[PDB]
Amino acid sequence: MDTCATLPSWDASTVYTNPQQVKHNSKRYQANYWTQNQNPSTNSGQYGPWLDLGNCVTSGAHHHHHH
């Protein structure tokens, strides 16, 4: 069962926060701070409302070592 089918989801009215993951069209994205409600691709420059994540699952290997 998918790692990316248990992620939180965004709500259209809600202003989003620091980089938790939210999902849409069964992929995810990550907000940095308050959103623009614009496309992320076009905002791939100056200001970063939300990042468009290339993957769904987190990367292999874990630099955090469970302290």
From TrEMBL:
Disulfide bonds join C4-C56. It comes from the Bacteria. Residues 7-53 form the Chitin-binding type-3 domain. This is Carbohydrate binding protein, putative, cpb33A. It comes from Cellvibrio japonicus (strain Ueda107) (Pseudomonas fluorescens subsp. cellulosa). The gene is cbp33A. The chain holds residues 251 to 309 of 397 of the full protein.
